[PDB]
Design a protein around this ligand. Structure first.
Ligand SMILES: NS(=O)(=O)c1ccc(NC(=O)NCCNCc2ccc(F)cc2)cc1
Ligand SMILES: [Zn+2]
Length: 257
């Protein structure tokens, strides 16, 4: 089993998953003086149906909000993509304290948390399971979360956590459009990368928003009060789940702006 402890964490993942030392690993530090503006990048277009929201689940190291993905009711288009990508999940990463928590960094600056909105290429593949290992299979929007004022748009998510406190618990999570969590501007960086935890597939086209969203210190505390243990065991809070940034290995981060 992999995790984020010193024994099973990011620094040891390569033992079980050798791709952890690959050439397209995520997250990365975005150095803005080295980004390349691309005039061929179109605007990001998201159109999500709130009826596709399905379920929230404690997965031990984090929690996931999953969506019905049987059709194109909820899609991401534009940016670097010619294909439509179907929403299937969003989740967060956070750190042990406010000073860190994001996965991507910008000019070395660490933010308090990071939102990931994940999609799969339904123009080319028939399912998430098929798409997840293909180089053009996944598209994930990352939004950096800067500690400050409480973010009211997180409210439904935060209010749901008390029903999935321990590992494996799950509950209906319906009628929610996660485009309400995105920043007002969708100016972005993009680069070819990977899942940020095992199985670390190098299948993700990343879309990192330039604008951050807010989160309060107490809202972050609610994430960290989720438990990684199963019901009845000694409580083990989910203190953190962000991977360190990884070498670019010659990749180009492109800017839409
Ligand atoms: N933090 S993140 O990079 O946004 C991020 C991290 C992890 C995920 N999870 C997945 O992608 N699960 C797909 C796994 N499907 C089973 C499977 C697929 C292929 C295969 F060969 C064997 C089994 C999503 C986003
Ligand atoms: Zn993630």
């Amino acid at each position: 089993d992999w995790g984020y402890d010193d024994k099973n964490g990011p620094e040891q993942w390569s033992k079980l998953y050798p791709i952890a030392n690959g050439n397209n690993q995520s997250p990365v530090d975005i150095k803005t003086s080295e980004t390349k503006h691309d005039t061929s990048l179109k605007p990001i277009s998201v159109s999500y149906n709130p009826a596709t929201a399905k379920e929230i689940i404690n997965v031990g190291h984090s929690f996931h909000v999953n969506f019905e993905d049987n059709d194109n009711r909820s899609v991401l288009k534009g940016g670097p993509f010619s294909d439509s990508y179907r929403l299937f999940q969003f989740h967060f990463h956070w750190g042990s304290t406010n000073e860190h928590g994001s996965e991507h960094t910008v000019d070395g600056v660490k933010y308090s948390a990071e939102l990931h909105v994940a999609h799969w290429n339904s123009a080319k593949y028939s399912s998430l399971a098929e798409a997840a290992s293909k180089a053009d299979g996944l598209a994930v929007i990352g939004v950096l979360m800067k500690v400050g004022e409480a973010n009211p748009k997180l409210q439904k998510v935060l209010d749901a956590l008390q029903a999935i406190k321990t590992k494996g618990k799950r509950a209906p999570f319906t009628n929610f459009d996660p485009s309400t969590l995105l920043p007002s501007s969708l100016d972005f960086w993009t680069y070819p990368g990977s899942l940020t935890h095992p199985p670390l597939y190098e299948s993700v086209t990343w879309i990192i928003c330039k604008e951050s969203i807010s989160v309060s210190s107490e809202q972050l505390a609610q994430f960290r009060s989720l438990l990684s243990n199963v019901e009845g065991d000694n409580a083990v809070p989910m203190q953190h789940n962000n991977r360190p940034t990884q070498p670019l290995k010659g990749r180009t981060v492109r800017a839409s702006f």
